[PDB]
């Protein structure tokens, strides 16, 4: 039973309760006014202030307003800034402040609140876990790692901390070390461990280490609703999209884009070769830990539906050609990029992040042997001047064992069943 009333608030419990009921009945108009009256009347009351804040939070809900939620965020702050605040209320107010900052996208602010909460409550392990999430959300994996090490050193059986530690290890390429934490944290059944993010990476770590256990966990993750299937493990999905590893141009409906890519393939090729020759630094090494070995770099013209101006100065005719196809230049969950892969390269089995795109590959320079790509259970080969199309939300794997480089052009398109509105609204990836 949360203890939200300090000594003075116990003396006005009747007014506080009456006002809370108006909020719980959806009369945010009246509830805001009643809690406002209580804040004026009792400017030091934490519970009155928390009521005001909760109603501001709800008002930002209804009107869906960043200024509104920012006000509520200060009011949760205000609750914490009043005198004699009960510990349970202090924790609730600041936790919700951090959460609403995150929900809005103010990850830096959330982090500040979370550090404060841990200073105020040094024995609360769930707060420490929450702080680790804040660090992860700003991309500060080093600090996240220390936080979860501290949690485990005190509560080594904490499943939430186990999965998150294993996530960080896996992301750092500590594959084997990562496995027991992901497995044990999932197996804990603790709150926050039933997350597809941990099934995905536990299986992937196992595959990299040649431990056949991997698909067991994939199946479990699909049993608990996290994956579309065992073979299609993407996590930013729109359910109801046709799912097949390999597509024909006709099936995708983007027949005109395929035609343009194939009819004009030599211009695309030549511009990529010219960049390889005179501006090779524009090709950046793949940086998502997908390679077992080998050299693989990409020269990106579009990402998240934004043209890279410098890059397109290097492939101007190709960018001009592509500009006619908003299905790709506006695919905010895909890229348009040259990709060069050299002999001795093996890309681990891997999965893209979203089922909202299909991936086209146009062959530009393809050695006669040694290059291949598997999607799901089928392995295929590229052809110079020809487009392959696959759904990279399915497990896929690539090998390069030729005696010279392999150059392709990668053109991501919106999944064709996605509606115009979805294409305008889906967050960019």
């Amino acid at each position: 039973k949360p203890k939200l009333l300090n000594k003075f608030d116990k003396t006005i419990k009747a007014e506080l309760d009456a006002a809370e009921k108006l909020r719980k009945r959806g009369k945010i108009e009246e509830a805001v006014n009643a809690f406002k009256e209580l804040v004026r009347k009792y400017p030091q009351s934490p519970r009155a202030r928390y009521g005001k804040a909760q109603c501001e939070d709800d008002l930002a809900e209804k009107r869906r307003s960043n200024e509104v939620l920012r006000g509520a965020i200060e009011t949760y702050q205000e609750v914490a800034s009043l005198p004699d605040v009960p510990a349970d209320l202090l924790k609730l107010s600041l936790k919700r402040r951090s959460d609403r900052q995150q929900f809005l996208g103010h990850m830096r602010g959330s982090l500040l609140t979370l550090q404060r909460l841990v200073q105020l409550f040094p024995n609360d392990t769930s707060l420490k876990n929450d702080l680790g999430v804040g660090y992860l959300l700003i991309g500060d994996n080093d600090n996240a790692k220390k936080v979860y090490e501290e949690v485990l050193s005190v509560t080594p059986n904490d499943g939430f901390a186990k999965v998150h530690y294993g996530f960080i290890l896996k992301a750092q390429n500590k594959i084997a070390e990562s496995i027991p934490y992901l497995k044990e944290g999932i197996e804990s059944g603790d709150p926050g461990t039933d997350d597809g993010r941990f099934y995905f990476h536990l299986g992937d770590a196992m595959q990299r280490v040649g431990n056949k256990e991997a698909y067991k966990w994939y199946e479990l993750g699909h049993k608990r609703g996290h994956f579309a299937s065992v073979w299609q493990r993407s996590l930013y999905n729109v359910n109801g999209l046709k799912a097949q590893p390999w597509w024909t141009p006709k099936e995708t409906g983007y027949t005109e884009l395929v035609k343009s890519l194939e009819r004009n393939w030599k211009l695309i090729r030549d511009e990529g070769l010219a960049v390889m020759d005179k501006a090779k630094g524009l090709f950046l090494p793949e940086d998502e830990n997908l390679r077992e070995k080998g050299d693989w770099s990409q020269f990106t013209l579009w990402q998240q539906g934004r043209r890279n101006e410098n890059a397109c100065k290097g492939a101007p005719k190709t960018c001009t050609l592509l500009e006619k196809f908003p299905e790709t230049t506006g695919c905010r969950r895909g890229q348009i990029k040259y990709s060069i892969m050299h002999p001795g390269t093996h890309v681990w089995p891997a999965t893209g992040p979203t089922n909202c795109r299909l991936r086209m590959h146009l062959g530009l320079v393809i050695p006669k042997e040694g290059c291949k790509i598997r999607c799901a259970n089928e392995t295929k080969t590229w052809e110079e001047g020809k487009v392959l199309i696959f759904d990279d939300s399915f497990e896929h794997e690539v090998w390069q064992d030729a005696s010279s480089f392999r150059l392709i052009f990668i053109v991501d398109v919106w999944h064709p069943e996605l509606t115009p509105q979805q294409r305008r609204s889906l967050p960019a990836i």
Binding site: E61, R64, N66, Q102, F103, L104, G105, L136, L137, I138, G139, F167, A171, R197, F200, S234, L235, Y236, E286, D287, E288, N289, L290, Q303, Q304, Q335, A350, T351, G352, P353, T354, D392, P427, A428, I429
Partner: peptide
């Protein structure tokens, strides 16, 4: 996360949130 999920799914979150 100050890195992006392009070919894979390696980041803790792949999107930036901002509103309702």
């Amino acid at each position: 996360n100050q890195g992006k999920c392009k070919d894979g799914l390696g980041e803790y979150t792949c999107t930036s949130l901002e509103g309702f």
